[PDB]
């Protein structure tokens, strides 16, 4: 058999991948790149085999020929007798979150406010909110809608990166990897928690997972869910308990992609690797847990229960859904 070469985005992912590789007896090995688009290019060149991707990045990968292999499955809201690997995925809820104390703010008064996004080109952080804003404003000038933002991946001198903070030294401002303080779900929620931004575009799970003591991290350890509100598209504000009736969209779960001729081997290796290091895996927590990273969602989201098999050997457009693909392609007309 062949080794599977994973692609880690940035140095924190690379460290976790190197621990996985050592524990896997090198059944998995690691390549690393600075951004997710650069990892996609390593896999297209055949210099890496696979990585797990947000749906906006699956669109970029899929336009280049890479295919979905397995999907993240988090705990289901409804009981199921099916094994995690065979249980159907339920998308996650993209939401817009604000502070309750910011009393005037609704979906309809976001213009000229400060925003926090997971990264350009990601589903909840960017494609869903900016796609809705372009459409509602009738304007492609989404780079001028908010007064300042942190949108990792955007031009670092532009207003879309003005709120980004870089790393411990202030280097790498706005890079779309975990070195940027405000990257990703947890970084964009921290941008809101710290009142750097007025609004964060994340998913429902992020707000729950980083409030009320669910996270012990210093910036989160003291946050209370009741201090946050969701912005609904009808211009109302709701408690974060009401995400099923106050979301911007339902997103397809993050999933692993690879080149088509390595998909079967990547699939078999991952099913074995999660049997060892997955949630309740043979070797987790004693040796290594593939789906933990101290809340930092490195390689996989920390709320992943397993990687699940896909139904219907789907193409990337079947996996993302036609409606979402068309929304992305509509927004990408602006660029």
């Amino acid at each position: 058999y062949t080794r599977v070469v994973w692609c880690a985005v940035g140095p924190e992912e690379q460290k976790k991948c190197q621990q996985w590789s050592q524990q896997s007896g090198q059944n998995v090995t690691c390549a690393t790149a600075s951004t997710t688009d650069d990892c996609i290019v390593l896999v297209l060149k055949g210099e890496a085999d696979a990585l797990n991707l947000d749906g906006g990045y699956i669109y970029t990968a899929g336009k280049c020929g890479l295919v979905p292999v397995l999907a993240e499955n988090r705990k289901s809201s409804k009981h199921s007798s099916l094994d995690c690997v065979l249980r159907p995925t339920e998308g996650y809820l993209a939401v817009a979150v604000v502070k309750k104390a910011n009393e005037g703010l609704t979906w309809n008064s976001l213009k000229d406010k400060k925003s926090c996004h997971t990264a350009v080109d990601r589903t909840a952080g960017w494609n869903i909110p900016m796609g809705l804003i372009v459409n509602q404003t009738g304007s492609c000038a989404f780079d001028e809608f908010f007064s300042q933002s942190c949108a990792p991946g955007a031009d670092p001198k532009s207003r879309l990166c003005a709120l980004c903070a870089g790393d411990d030294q202030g280097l790498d401002k706005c890079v779309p990897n975990s070195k940027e303080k405000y990257y990703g779900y947890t970084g964009a929620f921290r941008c809101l928690a710290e009142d750097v931004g007025d609004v964060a575009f994340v998913k429902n799970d992020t707000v729950w997972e980083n409030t009320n003591g669910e996270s012990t991290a210093d910036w989160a350890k003291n946050l209370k869910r009741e201090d946050f509100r969701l912005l609904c598209l009808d211009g109302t504000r709701k408690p974060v308990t009401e995400a099923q009736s106050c979301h911007l969209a339902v997103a397809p779960n993050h999933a692993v992609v690879s080149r088509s001729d390595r998909a079967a081997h990547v699939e078999q290796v991952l099913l074995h690797q999660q049997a060892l290091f997955g949630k309740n895996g043979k070797n987790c927590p004693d040796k290594f847990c593939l789906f933990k990273s101290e809340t930092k969602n490195l390689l996989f989201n920390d709320n992943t229960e397993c990687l699940a098999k896909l139904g219907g050997r789907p193409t990337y457009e079947e996996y993302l859904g036609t409606e979402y693909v068309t929304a992305i392609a509509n927004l990408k007309k602006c660029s």
Binding site: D37, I40, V41, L44, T60, K63, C64, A329, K332
Partner: peptide, 6 residues
């Protein structure tokens, strides 16, 4: 309906 970005 476009192609690969890279």
């Amino acid at each position: 309906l476009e192609a690969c970005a890279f």
